[PDB]
């Protein structure tokens, strides 16, 4: 608990599926750590299987002084060729914002994201009709539910 | 964890920079203890470096009765000479109230601390101009923000 995340704010919402993710993250730390914080953003391509997870981007942040600091994390959008099927972009998917210190994950922030396509009423459809949807990805927008993050913490060795 | 801090109270607030720190600390003890509690207060001279820390004073507390107990911890003020720059005393700084058992830190409570100089309006100045301020230390007063403690815990082997 040497570093705590006080806020994460999605700067561009809603946004095109293929626009980058821009997160303004604010954290607090009371010691001047020896190493960088290692941040990561992962698009979860299959909720069932981890093989379609895409590490969209990574960003080192440092050096870390004592206090409350912040930064902006601009990450690349998902790669659509890597998804199992094209219709998987639609409806609710997940992204995971995590930070490790010295290659040990200490916090993970999962987010639900809602994906809609122009002209298409997803609500009235069932899975079978959704698969049939001919997806035009340049017409698919997202909205991250940044208000309901599920936060997971992990104990790690810091500089101790 | 056998000992847990319930409350800390700053007796002399606001205070001159030079005035000693007076803390009324209240804590719980679940099973009795062989050794003394070792208390300590540290003034953080630098946000980016741990080597301008000033262990202000220490206090042994014992013997420890089971239950809820309380003591006064009086600590010497910081020494202006051991600061990187004279103007560092101004604005927000940090102190760390810490407790150890048998030379192992089990709790560390951090506090932010406001520092103002008579006649100086810090809120309308930029950092560069603050550096130019001829600090007269006997005109600087602190307020510890005692209502927002930043608690860190450590696992230790108590009487095992």
């Amino acid at each position: 608990s040497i570093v705590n995340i006080l806020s994460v704010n999605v700067l561009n919402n809603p946004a095109k599926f293929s626009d980058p993710y821009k997160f303004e993250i604010t954290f607090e730390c009371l010691e001047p750590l020896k190493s960088d914080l290692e941040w990561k953003l992962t698009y979860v391509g299959s909720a069932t299987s981890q093989s379609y997870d895409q590490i969209l981007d990574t960003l080192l942040v440092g050096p870390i002084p004592i206090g409350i600091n912040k930064f902006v994390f601009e990450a690349d959008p998902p790669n659509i060729d890597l998804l199992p099927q094209l219709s998987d972009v639609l409806g609710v998917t997940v992204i995971l914002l995590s930070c490790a210190y010295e290659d040990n994950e200490f916090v993970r922030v999962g987010y639900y994201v809602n994906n809609e396509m122009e002209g298409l009423n997803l609500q009235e459809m069932d899975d079978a009709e959704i698969k049939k949807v001919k997806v035009d990805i340049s017409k698919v927008w997202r909205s991250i539910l940044a208000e309901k993050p599920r936060v997971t913490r992990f104990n790690i060795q810091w500089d101790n | 964890s056998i000992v847990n801090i319930l409350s800390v109270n700053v007796l002399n607030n606001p205070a001159k920079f030079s005035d000693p720190y007076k803390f009324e600390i209240t804590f719980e003890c679940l099973e009795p203890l062989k050794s003394d509690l070792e208390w300590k207060l540290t003034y953080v001279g630098s946000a980016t470096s741990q080597s301008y820390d000033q262990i202000l004073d220490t206090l042994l507390v014992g013997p420890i009765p089971i239950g809820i107990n309380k003591f006064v911890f009086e600590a010497d003020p910081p020494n202006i000479d051991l600061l990187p720059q004279l103007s560092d005393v101004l604005g927000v700084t940090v102190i760390l109230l810490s407790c150890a058992y048998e030379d192992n830190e089990f709790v560390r409570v951090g506090y932010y601390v406001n520092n103002e100089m008579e006649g100086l309006n810090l809120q309308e100045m930029d950092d560069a101009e603050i550096k130019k301020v001829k600090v007269d230390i006997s005109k600087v007063w602190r307020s510890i923000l005692a209502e927002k403690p930043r608690v860190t815990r450590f696992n230790i082997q108590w009487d095992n």
């Binding site: 604010t26 960088d36 981007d57 990574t58 960003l59 080192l60 942040v61 440092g62 050096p63 870390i64 002084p65 206090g67 409350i68 600091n69 912040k70 930064f71 | 946000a47 604005g91 927000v92 700084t93 932010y112």
Partner: peptide, 10 residues
């Protein structure tokens, strides 16, 4: 890729 953090408080 690497950036310094921005102070918020102090």
């Amino acid at each position: 890729k690497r950036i310094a953090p921005t102070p918020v408080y102090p």
